[PDB]
Amino acid sequence: TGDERFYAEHLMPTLQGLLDPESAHRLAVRFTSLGLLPRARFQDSDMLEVRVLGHKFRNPVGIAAGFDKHGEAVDGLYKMGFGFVEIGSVTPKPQEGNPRPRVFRLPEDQAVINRYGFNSHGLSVVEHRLRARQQKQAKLTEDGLPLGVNLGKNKTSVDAAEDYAEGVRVLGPLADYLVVNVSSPNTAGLRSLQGKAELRRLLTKVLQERDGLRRVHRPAVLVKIAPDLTSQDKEDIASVVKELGIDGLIVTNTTVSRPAGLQGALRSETGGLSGKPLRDLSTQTIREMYALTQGRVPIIGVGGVSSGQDALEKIRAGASLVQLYTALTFWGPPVVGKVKRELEALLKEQGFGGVTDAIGADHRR
Numbered sequence: 001t002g003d004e005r006f007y008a009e010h011l012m013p014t015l016q017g018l019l020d021p022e023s024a025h026r027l028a029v030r031f032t033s034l035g036l037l038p039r040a041r042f043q044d045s046d047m048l049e050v051r052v053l054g055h056k057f058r059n060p061v062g063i064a065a066g067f068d069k070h071g072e073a074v075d076g077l078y079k080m081g082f083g084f085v086e087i088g089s090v091t092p093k094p095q096e097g098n099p100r101p102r103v104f105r106l107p108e109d110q111a112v113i114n115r116y117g118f119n120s121h122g123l124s125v126v127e128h129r130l131r132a133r134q135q136k137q138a139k140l141t142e143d144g145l146p147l148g149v150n151l152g153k154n155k156t157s158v159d160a161a162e163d164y165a166e167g168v169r170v171l172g173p174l175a176d177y178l179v180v181n182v183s184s185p186n187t188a189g190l191r192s193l194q195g196k197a198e199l200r201r202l203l204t205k206v207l208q209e210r211d212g213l214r215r216v217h218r219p220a221v222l223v224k225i226a227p228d229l230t231s232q233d234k235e236d237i238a239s240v241v242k243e244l245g246i247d248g249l250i251v252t253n254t255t256v257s258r259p260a261g262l263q264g265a266l267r268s269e270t271g272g273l274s275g276k277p278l279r280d281l282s283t284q285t286i287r288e289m290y291a292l293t294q295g296r297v298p299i300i301g302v303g304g305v306s307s308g309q310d311a312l313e314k315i316r317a318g319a320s321l322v323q324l325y326t327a328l329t330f331w332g333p334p335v336v337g338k339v340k341r342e343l344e345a346l347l348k349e350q351g352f353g354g355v356t357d358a359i360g361a362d363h364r365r
């Protein structure tokens with residue numbers, strides 16, 4: 001399509017020349033919440049439909065956490081064509097995050113490095129914002145367009161588990177699923193909440209809080225992990241997740257590694273790297289987690305997805321759903337239709353009836 005080329009070759013490179021990445025991000029959020037977005041032409045095929053996490057998803061392509069941190073653009077994102085939307089991370093109290101600049105483009109690598117540090121409007125602001133459209137969301141969810149809420153912790157917080165517990169109580173009733181983000185590279189000490197006995201403590205408390213919500217307001221609970229885990233970390237996570245009955249895994253967050261071959265001038269900036277250089281590390285982590293959980297724990301695959309083939313590789317590796325964030329900053333909105341359309345053509349070619357049949361297919365052949 002000419003739409004896709006025009007955004008990739010002209011529109012998005014123009015935006016890059018005009019604005020720094022954080023301004024571009026804020027402008028995008030503003031324009032999305034106003035509904036100012038091109039054609040919704042591609043009507044979703046039945047092949048793209050997935051049933052997982054106690055819900056129907058019209059299509060398996062979601063927007064990853066971080067684009068809509070404060071829940072301002074949910075409806076614009078469904079209009080863009082995403083089959084589900086995740087907001088956050090949201091922290092209990094408002095906070096500024098790190099000083100600017102904090103986000104950096106690596107156009108040669110199709111990569112971004114960010115160190116936002118959980119800038120959040122806080123639970124209360126986000127709660128009221130989601131309450132204003134709650135019934136609208138209940139009809140979207142019923143129509144196969146679910147909402148996820150990603151939870152983080154405040155910087156100065158003494159008690160990590162309590163920050164997540166507050167998030168469960170406040171935003172849990174408003175979410176189809178919740179994400180315990182234990183994998184941000186940009187809050188000190190946060191990533192070691194991924195070691196055994198302390199991860200069992202934390203998730204036990206989270207699941208207890210969740211179980212104490214009323215039935216129609218009781219969301220699925222997922223854990224979001226980094227691509228930088230040791231084999232030991234991964235084995236411990238799989239074990240805790242099976243023992244406790246966690247509903248699923250999001251795989252993966254951004255990486256603190258800098259793979260050999262990055263060209264961008266800004267490659268040595270502190271922060272998490274996303275986009276194309278993260279793609280295969282993330283696919284390999286999906287593959288490992290799926291095998292370690294015996295295919296019993298639904299996985300949302302994320303990291304460098306920018307085409308139907310990328311999405312299909314994650315699905316075949318064991319993802320039931322996928323997300324993207326960085327691709328959108330290089331291709332703009334038409335990237336959503338592109339990934340859906342290529343994913344559907346590839347499923348026909350490899351002889352799958354729908355997305356469901358492809359899930360984990362690499363582990364059976």
Ligand SMILES: Cc1nc(Cl)sc1C(=O)Nc1cccc(Oc2ccc(NC(=O)/C(C#N)=C(\O)C3CC3)cc2)c1
Pocket residue numbers: 015020021022024025027028029031032036037038103105112328329330332333
């Ligand atoms: C206004 C309008 N009028 C017509 Cl007629 S079509 C159209 C349009 O293209 N709308 C539109 C609206 C919202 C986002 C968008 O595309 C995006 C999506 C994401 C980003 N984000 C970034 O560029 C970006 C960067 N760099 C980031 O998000 C940084 C933080 C990672 C920018 C534009 C495009």
Ligand SMILES: Cc1cc2nc3c(=O)[nH]c(=O)nc-3n(C[C@H](O)[C@H](O)[C@H](O)COP(=O)(O)O)c2cc1C
Pocket residue numbers: 064065066067069088089103112114116118150181224252253254274275276278302303304305323324325326327
């Ligand atoms: C600017 C930016 C902000 C992000 N913020 C968050 C966040 O708040 N919480 C979270 O769990 N992930 C966050 N992520 C990670 C994305 O959700 C996704 O896991 C990661 O970027 C890999 O996907 P991608 O390569 O498609 O961008 C962020 C990523 C970027 C680029």
Ligand SMILES: O=C(O)c1cc(=O)[nH]c(=O)[nH]1
Pocket residue numbers: 066089114115116117118119181183184185186253254272
């Ligand atoms: O806010 C951030 O810095 C952030 C959080 C997160 O989970 N992942 C990421 O790349 N950045």
